[PDB]
Amino acid sequence: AAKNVVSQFVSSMSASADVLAMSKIEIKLSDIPEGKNMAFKWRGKPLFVRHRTKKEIDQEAAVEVSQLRDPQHDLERVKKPEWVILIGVCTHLGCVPIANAGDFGGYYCPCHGSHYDASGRIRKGPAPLNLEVPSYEFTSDDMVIVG
Amino acid sequence: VAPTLTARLYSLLFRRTSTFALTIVVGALFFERAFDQGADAIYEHINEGKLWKHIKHK
Amino acid sequence: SDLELHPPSYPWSHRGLLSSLDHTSIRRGFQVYKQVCSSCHSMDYVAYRHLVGVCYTEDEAKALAEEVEVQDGPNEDGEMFMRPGKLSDYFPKPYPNPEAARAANNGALPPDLSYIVRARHGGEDYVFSLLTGYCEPPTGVSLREGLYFNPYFPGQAIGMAPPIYNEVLEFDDGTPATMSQVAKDVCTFLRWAAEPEHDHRKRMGLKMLLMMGLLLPLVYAMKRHKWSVLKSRKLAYRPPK
Amino acid sequence: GRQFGHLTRVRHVITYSLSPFEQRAFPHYFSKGIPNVLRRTRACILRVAPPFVAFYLVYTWGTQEFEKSKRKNPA
Amino acid sequence: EEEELVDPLTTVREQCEQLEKCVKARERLELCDERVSSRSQTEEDCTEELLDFLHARDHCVAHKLFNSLK
Amino acid sequence: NIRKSHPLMKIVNNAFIDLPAPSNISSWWNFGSLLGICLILQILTGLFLAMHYTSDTTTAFSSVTHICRDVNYGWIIRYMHANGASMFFICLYMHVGRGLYYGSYTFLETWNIGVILLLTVMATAFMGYVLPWGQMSFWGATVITNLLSAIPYIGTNLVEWIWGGFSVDKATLTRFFAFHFILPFIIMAIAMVHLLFLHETGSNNPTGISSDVDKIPFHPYYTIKDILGALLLILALMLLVLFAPDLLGDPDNYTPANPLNTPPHIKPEWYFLFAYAILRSIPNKLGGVLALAFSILILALIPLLHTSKQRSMMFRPLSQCLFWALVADLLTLTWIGGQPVEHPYITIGQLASVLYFLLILVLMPTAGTIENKLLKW
Numbered sequence: 032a033a034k035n036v037v038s039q040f041v042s043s044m045s046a047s048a049d050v051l052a053m054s055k056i057e058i059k060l061s062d063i064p065e066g067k068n069m070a071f072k073w074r075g076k077p078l079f080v081r082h083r084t085k086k087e088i089d090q091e092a093a094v095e096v097s098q099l100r101d102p103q104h105d106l107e108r109v110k111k112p113e114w115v116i117l118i119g120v121c122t123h124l125g126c127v128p129i130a131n132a133g134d135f136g137g138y139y140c141p142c143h144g145s146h147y148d149a150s151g152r153i154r155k156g157p158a159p160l161n162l163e164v165p166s167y168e169f170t171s172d173d174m175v176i177v178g
Numbered sequence: 179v180a181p182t183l184t185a186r187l188y189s190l191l192f193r194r195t196s197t198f199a200l201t202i203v204v205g206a207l208f209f210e211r212a213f214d215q216g217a218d219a220i221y222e223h224i225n226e227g228k229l230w231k232h233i234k235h236k
Numbered sequence: 237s238d239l240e241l242h243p244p245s246y247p248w249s250h251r252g253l254l255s256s257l258d259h260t261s262i263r264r265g266f267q268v269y270k271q272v273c274s275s276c277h278s279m280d281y282v283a284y285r286h287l288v289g290v291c292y293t294e295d296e297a298k299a300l301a302e303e304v305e306v307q308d309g310p311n312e313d314g315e316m317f318m319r320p321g322k323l324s325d326y327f328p329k330p331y332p333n334p335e336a337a338r339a340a341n342n343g344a345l346p347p348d349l350s351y352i353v354r355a356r357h358g359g360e361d362y363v364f365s366l367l368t369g370y371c372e373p374p375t376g377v378s379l380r381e382g383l384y385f386n387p388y389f390p391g392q393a394i395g396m397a398p399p400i401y402n403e404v405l406e407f408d409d410g411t412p413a414t415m416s417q418v419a420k421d422v423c424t425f426l427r428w429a430a431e432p433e434h435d436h437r438k439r440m441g442l443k444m445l446l447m448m449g450l451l452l453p454l455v456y457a458m459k460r461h462k463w464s465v466l467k468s469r470k471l472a473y474r475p476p477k
Numbered sequence: 478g479r480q481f482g483h484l485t486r487v488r489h490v491i492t493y494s495l496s497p498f499e500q501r502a503f504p505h506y507f508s509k510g511i512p513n514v515l516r517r518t519r520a521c522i523l524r525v526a527p528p529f530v531a532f533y534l535v536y537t538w539g540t541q542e543f544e545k546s547k548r549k550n551p552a
Numbered sequence: 553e554e555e556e557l558v559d560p561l562t563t564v565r566e567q568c569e570q571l572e573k574c575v576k577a578r579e580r581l582e583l584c585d586e587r588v589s590s591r592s593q594t595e596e597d598c599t600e601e602l603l604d605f606l607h608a609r610d611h612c613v614a615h616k617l618f619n620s621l622k
Numbered sequence: 623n624i625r626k627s628h629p630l631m632k633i634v635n636n637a638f639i640d641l642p643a644p645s646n647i648s649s650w651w652n653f654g655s656l657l658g659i660c661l662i663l664q665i666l667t668g669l670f671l672a673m674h675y676t677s678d679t680t681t682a683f684s685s686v687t688h689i690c691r692d693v694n695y696g697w698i699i700r701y702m703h704a705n706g707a708s709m710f711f712i713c714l715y716m717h718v719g720r721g722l723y724y725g726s727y728t729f730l731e732t733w734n735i736g737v738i739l740l741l742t743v744m745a746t747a748f749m750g751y752v753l754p755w756g757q758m759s760f761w762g763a764t765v766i767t768n769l770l771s772a773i774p775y776i777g778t779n780l781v782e783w784i785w786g787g788f789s790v791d792k793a794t795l796t797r798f799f800a801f802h803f804i805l806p807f808i809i810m811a812i813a814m815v816h817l818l819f820l821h822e823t824g825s826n827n828p829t830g831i832s833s834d835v836d837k838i839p840f841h842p843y844y845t846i847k848d849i850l851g852a853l854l855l856i857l858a859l860m861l862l863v864l865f866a867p868d869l870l871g872d873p874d875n876y877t878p879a880n881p882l883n884t885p886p887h888i889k890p891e892w893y894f895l896f897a898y899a900i901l902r903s904i905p906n907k908l909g910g911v912l913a914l915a916f917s918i919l920i921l922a923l924i925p926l927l928h929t930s931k932q933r934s935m936m937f938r939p940l941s942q943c944l945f946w947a948l949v950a951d952l953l954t955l956t957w958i959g960g961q962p963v964e965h966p967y968i969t970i971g972q973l974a975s976v977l978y979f980l981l982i983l984v985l986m987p988t989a990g991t992i993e994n995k996l997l998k999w
């Protein structure tokens with residue numbers, strides 16, 4: 032009885048009308064210019080969708096798999112070479128990777144401070160990983176969804 | 179049965195507070211598995227809303 | 237007038253300690269709710285996923301939700317839009333504010349159906365008694381049409397009507413739905429909308445009785461064991477001669 | 478306060494005890510037990526019981542008059 | 553409605569309504585009913601007699617009902 | 623060694639381990655720990671409730687439903703709180719009664735603190751019931767709070783001061799929440815002082831005689847008997863919350879608040895019903911609330927009317943009957959209190975109220991004197 036009563040009380044601090052998860056938001060990509068960071072609501076979390084101008088894909092086509100934490104390339108992330116859909120969280124804490132103002136690529140992950148790039152990747156330090164690609168998947172070329 | 183079950187329960191498992199604690203905790207596990215299910219089972223003498231029974235129909 | 241009648245005791249499948257709740261009935265009762273009852277009665281404390289594990293299957297419940305619509309979030313301007321209901325929005329206010337009920341309903345306000353079984357004595361019995369049983373207004377009683385006559389209902393002047401008139405049917409397994417069967421089911425479903433926890437409540441209760449029934453004797457034997465030095469104990473008084 | 482060894486002064490009283498692991502926790506439980514509960518009940522009924530029945534009666538009477546009052550024949 | 557749904561209530565009610573306790577109760581109903589009609593400036597309104605009948609009937613209804621219901 | 627010397631352990635040791643206790647206390651002494659238990663159970667389920675409840679009129683009721691449907695195990699937590707409040711009252715009523723019967727009140731400080739403890743939980747529980755913002759929550763909040771308006775020249779202002787508005791509105795709910803949170807902690811400090819004064823003499827016992835001559839350590843003996851005791855509290859509590867969650871609350875208080883309705887009902891929860899009966903038995907605004915109050919503060923007069931040469935009732939037959947007539951009379955009072963103020967109920971509710979006061983203030987002390995005389999004392 033002790034466990035059970037304790038467990039109930041403990042398990043009471045978790046769910047509710049909080050299993051929602053709808054989203055899969057209607058996005059459109061030529062609809063947004065060429066590289067403008069665009070956050071949505073996916074189960075809540077700000078889905079940072081930055082597009083890719085040719086020039087800025089080449090700084091992302093330039094990574095370092097030899098010297099890396101979570102081994103990957105911008106190409107090894109995105110399935111359609113110039114359309115990676117990012118998110119806003121930061122693998123360390125909760126500073127949604129602010130559009131620009133950072134080191135490599137573009138991205139910057141504040142809170143305190145951590146530097147990202149146009150693949151979400153952690154270039155400098157604080158955040159252990161490279162953000163989260165919501166399967167990033169589309170519908171057609173211009174048309175796009177998530178998941 | 180013979181030189182007593184309790185006697186052996188005492189001699190082999192209850193003379194130390196260690197083994198005592200240890201059996202109670204091991205005995206706690208199984209009991210939960212046996213009872214939680216046992217009571218859920220006995221409860222099945224109500225083959226009604228029995229989600230399993232409905233699962234087959236729809 | 238302060239003169240009235242109290243509902244009898246119907247033998248529901250969910251009364252009497254350890255007792256499930258007829259789930260096939262909650263479902264027919266849901267049907268009754270959506271078709272005939274919902275038109276003028278809100279059940280704003282119940283959502284579509286509540287109907288999941290219980291009666292319907294996941295897909296089934298969504299399909300019902302999908303069907304009609306609600307006013308979903310703001311269109312990128314400042315007007316809202318419509319879309320097929322998801323599993324997460326509560327059943328569907330037929331009247332905006334309270335005075336809308338008065339307007340479309342003689343001047344009376346039909347009370348919410350989220351609880352009702354717990355908000356009226358006798359519970360399902362009162363609803364059952366209010367439903368099925370309807371009578372001819374006796375002599376000297378002056379109805380006035382808006383108010384119908386109803387035994388059980390306090391004052392006897394109601395405003396509802398008997399929306400059970402043997403039908404406006406539905407059906408899965410095709411239950412011969414007379415006014416009786418259609419009433420039992422609503423109440424059974426109503427029990428569930430009021431007290432969803434009903435089943436589990438009584439399951440823990442079974443376990444609580446079995447455990448208490450096992451701990452109680454044991455804790456007693458623990459206690460008499462230690463008190464035995466005192467219960468069995470002897471005194472003698474040996475003063476100097 | 479109070480402790481043990483500073484309670485009071487007692488003289489010439491022996492107390493025999495027996496270890497709990499050497500006696501039964503439920504000796505004549507039904508044998509000696511039940512007669513005792515009957516004896517305790519006897520001793521107390523005449524002081525507990527009456528006040529209550531006085532209410533028991535006041536209760537049923539009280540309700541009848543109430544219910545029977547909300548009715549009437551002529552006038 | 554016009555004829556063809558076998559309302560169990562109606563069926564069990566017949567047998568129920570009939571019975572002794574309700575026979576007597578309905579007698580008083582009719583008794584009082586016929587008084588109320590037999591005048592003008594009256595007010596003894598026959599409301600009580602109805603409930604008593606119903607009560608007696610309804611207890612017996614509950615006892616015999618749901619048995620048949622599916 | 624370690625238990626006896628260490629600054630914190632001493633306290634525990636002196637209160638639950640080596641405390642000399644009479645080898646004589648019966649079941650009626652268990653309500654002490656039981657209240658202690660009820661107090662914690664009521665703070666613990668209470669806190670978890672505050673993690674989901676919101677004290678604003680438009681979400682108040684909704685948040686309580688949110689708890690029972692959506693919050694995992696919210697329902698048990700909710701009903702345990704609800705029923706623990708009644709369980710806390712049955713125990714409170716056993717405890718006061720026990721002391722009255724056994725002369726335990728001769729320990730003035732302990733007792734007087736006990737009366738402060740009785741009032742504190744009553745004020746606490748009354749605020750508790752208003753929180754869900756149900757029909758009864760609002761009208762019970764209205765009816766009861768309005769009593770203070772009988773106090774001359776101060777009353778109107780008083781009622782308006784605590785109300786926050788001119789009614790039981792927004793200010794009142796949030797207000798009542800805050801005090802319902804702060805009260806049980808204060809209750810605790812006070813229960814510590816209750817136990818502090820009690821420890822100065824140790825417990826009384828059924829004979830009212832004196833047990834220095836036969837004390838036993840609180841440990842195996844009363845720890846293990848309190849355990850078995852708490853277990854039975856749990857049974858009663860759980861039997862209530864699992865099988866009949868709304869039994870003592872009655873099917874009623876659902877449906878939100880409506881400041882224009884006024885249900886033909888209006889009665890506080892069962893634990894105030896005896897007081898409720900006494901109040902309405904008196905045709906008079908002032909007198910009603912004066913006698914309402916007096917019906918509880920009279921516990922502070924009991925020791926001044928002891929009268930008997932023996933402390934307990936164990937050896938006093940006439941007093942026993944009179945005591946039982948008090949309890950019997952208190953049933954009548956709650957029973958009446960739970961009924962409309964019409965024909966039969968008024969006059970007995972009136973008579974029973976006079977009896978309550980006649981019994982405690984005149985009949986009981988007289989019986990003591992008679993009893994002394996029959997024993998040639």
Ligand code: HEM
Binds near residue numbers: 393395
């Ligand atoms: C869709 C058509 C319906 C309308 C227009 C309607 C309207 C009303 C009205 C006006 C009242 C208040 C009666 C009064 O205050 O005098 C009422 C009460 C009530 N309604 Fe309906 N109703 C409908 C269907 C239903 C159904 C199908 C049920 C349940 C099976 C239901 C459940 C109830 C109950 C249990 C009450 C009792 C309130 C009380 O006892 O105080 N309603 N309804």
Ligand code: HEM
Binds near residue numbers: 710803
């Ligand atoms: C500081 C500790 C406490 C906290 C944090 C607390 C919290 C709450 C909350 C949030 C509610 C509203 C939710 C609800 O109604 O279920 C509530 C209601 C209530 N409280 Fe407490 N409470 C505490 C102590 C107590 C005490 C000691 C009592 C006295 C027995 C009490 C009696 C009640 C009652 C009777 C209700 C309404 C019953 C109900 O609707 O469930 N509470 N409490």
Ligand code: HEM
Binds near residue numbers: 721743824
């Ligand atoms: C928060 C509520 C209360 C708590 C936690 C509490 C606690 C206790 C405890 C733990 C005891 C130990 C003795 C025993 O087990 O009976 C006790 C005894 C006592 N209490 Fe309370 N009590 C409360 C309310 C009351 C009130 C309402 C009264 C009466 C006005 C009261 C008056 C007394 C008296 C006179 C004793 C001495 C009993 C004896 O020695 O026979 N307490 N109380």
Ligand code: FES
Binds near residue numbers: 121123141142143157
């Ligand atoms: S998580 Fe961004 S620096 Fe802390």
